[PDB]
From a paper:
The metazoan [name] ligase complex ([name]-LC) has essential roles in [name] biogenesis and unfolded protein response. Its catalytic subunit [name] contains a conserved active-site cysteine that is susceptible to metal ion-induced oxidative inactivation. To preserve the function of [name] under aerobic conditions, the [name]-LC relies on the flavin adenine dinucleotide (FAD)-containing oxidoreductase [name] to protect its catalytic center from oxidation. Here, we report a cryogenic electron microscopic structure of the human [name]–[name] complex, revealing that [name] directly interacts with the catalytic center of [name] through its carboxy-terminal tail.
Numbering used by the authors:
A (entry chain B): 11 to 43, 75 to 202, 232 to 285, 294 to 500
B (entry chain A): 4 to 432, 475 to 505
The structure:
Amino acid sequence: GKFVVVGGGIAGVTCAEQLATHFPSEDILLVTAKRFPNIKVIESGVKQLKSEEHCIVTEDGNQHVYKKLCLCAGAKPKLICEGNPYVLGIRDTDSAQEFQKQLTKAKRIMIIGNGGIALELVYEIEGCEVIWAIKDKAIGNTFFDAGAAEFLTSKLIAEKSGSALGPDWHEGLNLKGTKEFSHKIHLETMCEVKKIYLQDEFRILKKKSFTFPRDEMWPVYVELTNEKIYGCDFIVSATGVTPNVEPFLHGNSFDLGEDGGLKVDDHMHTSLPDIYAAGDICTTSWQLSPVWQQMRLWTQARQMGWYAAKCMAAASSGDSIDMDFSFELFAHVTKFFNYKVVLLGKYNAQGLGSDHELMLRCTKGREYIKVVMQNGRMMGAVLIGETDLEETFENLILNQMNLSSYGEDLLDPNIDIEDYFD
Amino acid sequence: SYNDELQFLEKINKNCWRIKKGFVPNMQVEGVFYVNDALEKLMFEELRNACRGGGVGGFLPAMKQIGNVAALPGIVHRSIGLPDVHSGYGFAIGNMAAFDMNDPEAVVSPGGVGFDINCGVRLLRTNLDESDVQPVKEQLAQAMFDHIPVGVGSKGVIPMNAKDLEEALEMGVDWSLREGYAWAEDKEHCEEYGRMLQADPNKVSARAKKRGLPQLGTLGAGNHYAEIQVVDEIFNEYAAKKMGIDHKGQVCVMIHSGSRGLGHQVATDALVAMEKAMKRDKIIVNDRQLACARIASPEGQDYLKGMAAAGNYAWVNRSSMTFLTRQAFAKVFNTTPDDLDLHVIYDVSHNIAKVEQHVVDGKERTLLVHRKGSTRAFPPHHPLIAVDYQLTGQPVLIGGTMGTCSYVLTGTEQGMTETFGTTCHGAGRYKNVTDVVNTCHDAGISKKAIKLRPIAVIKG
Ligand SMILES: Cc1cc2c(cc1C)N(C[C@H](O)[C@H](O)[C@H](O)COP(=O)(O)OP(=O)(O)OC[C@H]1O[C@@H](n3cnc4c(N)ncnc43)[C@H](O)[C@@H]1O)c1[nH]c(=O)[nH]c(=O)c1N2
Ligand SMILES: NC(=O)c1ccc[n+]([C@@H]2O[C@H](COP(=O)([O-])OP(=O)(O)OC[C@H]3O[C@@H](n4cnc5c(N)ncnc54)[C@H](O)[C@@H]3O)[C@@H](O)[C@H]2O)c1
Ligand SMILES: [Mg+2]
Ligand SMILES: [Mg+2]
């Protein structure tokens, strides 16, 4: 009967807001664990969808009947080893306070992961020794190329200038370690955690901790896949994130993607009747345009929740609705090491396969710009620095203008390419 | 060779140069470039650098681009380069070209509008002085960045619907004034009252409309910004009094924005249709970039209908950004937006084509003036302009970047007779705003009335 949306995450709240605007005479329920009194909040977490009976039951034991249901349960932090008190992974504001408390009392903290959480934390935290170990050859393999890593890593040497946290939780807490030494960091490439040894296990085996990374009896010691073993007061495992499919998959035969998300069609339908999904829980199975890709984020979640609400409204009106332009081109504009990072289309030339070419213009400690052109037509580009050319690169990508005549000079310093295609 | 190209080029007057016919394979009329002694050195260096480059591909020198526009069917007056002239797709940036709408062989060029449509600037006066705002400038900046959406991938706070978008595309500022996001004084102090009567929303492509629905009420990336400024100097006290700048240190705000996505899609849709028509109607053009359609042909009518729609959309975006700016000031200085005197000095566009009445060769004709990088500057007694500026002259708003001071000018009779009332828009993102405006004044095509220094920049 009443429309139901699951999650106080950006996708769920934005889906519920838009859906409430489309049907102001009917109520929407945002189940989760004002400006629109049409939306009520249940404040509880569901344990089982019942797709055959069209029902949801929460931890309250309350049963709900849905005409449409949008699943937006977000995603759990994956961990190197769950259950250990010395592992942390950021998920929610409660976990950010726990991280604050542990961090405000400690030194010698290890971070494992080359993903977005680690990329923020290595710049936000100061006054702890940061041991960094990454499974890849260079920093930021998810969001950057090898040449991009060399620009942003050279910045790392210099001194600092119940919904899940969104684009900028790092402003709402103060993160200073006891040492008070700004940006003392070491990076270990190709490494993975072999095992986690508590102090007691280390004492029994009589192994020796590697010396502090450079140009004492710690609580926990972690061994790498290399010959070097290091201790810490606690360890931050970024490890990526896994969709919260576990509490929903029980008892109903959802089709799951290779990333474990609920597969969704072009109208966001989950391959079960009447059930939609948006944000990290969903996985995009429709025919992708050449310059789009799905990476879990705040911007894509906001867009997916909007589109899901539009598609749900379409099915109730019986009307046909076309796909929203936000799925035509991927763009993410964000901050890493106090540098703007706008990645447009196939920024790392992903899915181009054999056919692609690279044009790069960069000034040391100023800006790094790279252009990916598969056939003389720009599929994607990486923009880093204070450059304001992001609209121009966006437009050239969605036009597919043949830039072959403009040659290698499309990124020459003296030509105002932004003015040229304004 | 450089010395061979030089034979086509001579000096008309202290601040203007001529491009004689034959500089490019076909030329209907001569070219002219308006320059100061300094910005001239740079305009010639572009041509010489291109000459040293054997078989050079793309990014042709600005002077050659002026000549390729002189090759176009129907050019009625000198192809003229304003001081801001620099490399631009098809037409060189700063170029005015005018074509007689009554001549049977005529041309509409998308490159002679730009890829955006109706990029412009809207200055707003405020009774507060620099000393009222300077202690709270950081609060006002955050309030503006909170109120005004900025940057790529951004989404507008103002609700937008497809029907209301089509109304705004057909109705321009009148739509914003009716909605409650603008005031009747905003309609008056606006170029053409912010209205394009030839606009047809049904001409705009569906993809352009898809780009338009979410982008409305957002500045975007690039040179689109809103900036808070304070008056530095008053060169024409009568003009300042007429526009409500009474004393130096008074606060104002510039909103530079235009068509976002809708324009680029409309322009690129036109270039594809023109490529078919150029072979059909035998429009022969010296560069492939210079797409061209006869005004009589459906392609020329279609782009001119689209251009007008994108202009109405761009004007609505400027009015929305103005509405948001007034709210941000009202919160920070704790009082009603009208009690702070947030009225508009002017609104003017630097990338549009318009049909205008000009007397050419002693006989008045209705001409389509293609100007990109160029702002309208109608003479002190022109009948079309605002009643308040019907004596002083239509204000020209000239926008800086990187903290360089902006200038507010006015239109002149000499500029009307020589340039069809065309003046600079702004400095290249090495030719300073100051050099460019000093030439437009020294050549008598503009009259500096105010000077302004930015203090807060709301970019993306
Ligand atoms: C530390 C950190 C840092 C960043 C980011 C994440 C994190 C954790 N992200 C990613 C981004 O925050 C995230 O991917 C999106 O907010 C996804 O939001 P969802 O809509 O999926 O909801 P979200 O993932 O927030 O869903 C959480 C909500 O789901 C509901 N829920 C969970 N389990 C449930 C159950 N069993 N039953 C019912 N309800 C349940 C609860 O209400 C809970 O509040 C990000 N993005 C970005 O663009 N820029 C950035 O800088 C960052 N940085
Ligand atoms: N501004 C941003 O882009 C930003 C910042 C923070 C978080 N986020 C997003 O939030 C989500 C969570 O961030 P995240 O960093 O956990 O996700 P992520 O997907 O970016 O992290 C994946 C990383 O985990 C590493 N990894 C996985 N298993 C590992 C193992 N066993 N040993 C070592 N390394 C291992 C991989 O090498 C990879 O670098 C992501 O979607 C991320 O994009 C966004
Ligand atoms: Mg502009
Ligand atoms: Mg523009």
